């Protein structure tokens, strides 16, 4: 984990110092191909979730269920897990306040707290595992479902 | 200058007022700790 994170720091510093590795011509070609594909299929862009969305609550329940699936197996809860469960329960108890907070985060939130990283050891390689703040986790889960 | 103490009921010099309030209520359990 220490070696991989040192290598990742080197790679990120290289990207920042040496700029994007995609030349403008390549990016333009990729973007033009995507635009032509979308125009051919007649794809309407996904709009921002309206405040009067017909499914604004079903998607929130689906998102909260996925966040509670990590705790479906009975286990001893530490502080972070019970804080996340309290946040999920608060969102379920007042769905509209949670939805308003989610939309506010989608509109105005561009900075986020640091996320922890661990590595699942499969004994053949390392699979990165990311721990995000539960408050941002709810918004990300709702966004994924929507 | 001279000021009346809100913690001791005595007159003190104006220059020592800040320290007088800072150490006039030093909690004795701090000394115990």
């Amino acid at each position: 984990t220490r070696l991989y994170l040192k290598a990742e720091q080197e790679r990120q510093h290289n990207y920042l110092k040496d700029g994007p590795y995609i030349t403008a011509e390549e990016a333009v070609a990729v973007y033009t191909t995507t635009v032509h594909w979308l125009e051919s299929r007649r794809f309407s862009p996904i709009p921002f979730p309206p405040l009067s969305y017909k499914h604004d609550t079903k998607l929130l329940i689906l998102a909260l269920e996925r966040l509670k699936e990590a705790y479906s197996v009975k286990s001893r809860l530490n502080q972070s897990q019970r804080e996340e469960l309290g946040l999920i329960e608060q969102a379920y108890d007042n769905p509209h306040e949670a939805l308003s907070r989610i939309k506010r985060h989608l509109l105005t939130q561009r900075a986020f707290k640091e996320v922890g990283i661990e590595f699942m050891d499969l004994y053949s390689h390392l699979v990165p595992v990311y721990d995000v703040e539960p408050l941002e986790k709810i918004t990300d889960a709702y966004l994924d479902q929507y | 200058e001279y000021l009346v103490s809100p913690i001791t009921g005595e007159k003190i010099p104006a220059s020592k007022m800040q320290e007088h309030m800072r150490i006039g209520l030093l909690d004795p359990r701090w000394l115990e700790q």
Binding site: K68, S72, S75, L77, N78, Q79, L85 | -
Partner: protein, 50 residues
């Protein structure tokens, strides 16, 4: 051999950057899973007749 006695004495003591919450955290209490999880696992498996 070029480090003088005063320079040897000038070596500083090593301190710890992390604060009290990381060095000596309070005990992390473990609590049971809320009863609503048993209830919700119990709701599943109840099937509509139509």
């Amino acid at each position: 051999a070029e480090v003088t006695e005063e320079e040897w004495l000038s070596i500083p003591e090593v301190g710890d950057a992390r604060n009290k919450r990381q060095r000596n955290p309070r005990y992390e209490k473990l609590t049971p899973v809320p009863d609503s999880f048993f209830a919700k696992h119990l709701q599943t498996g109840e099937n509509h007749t139509s």
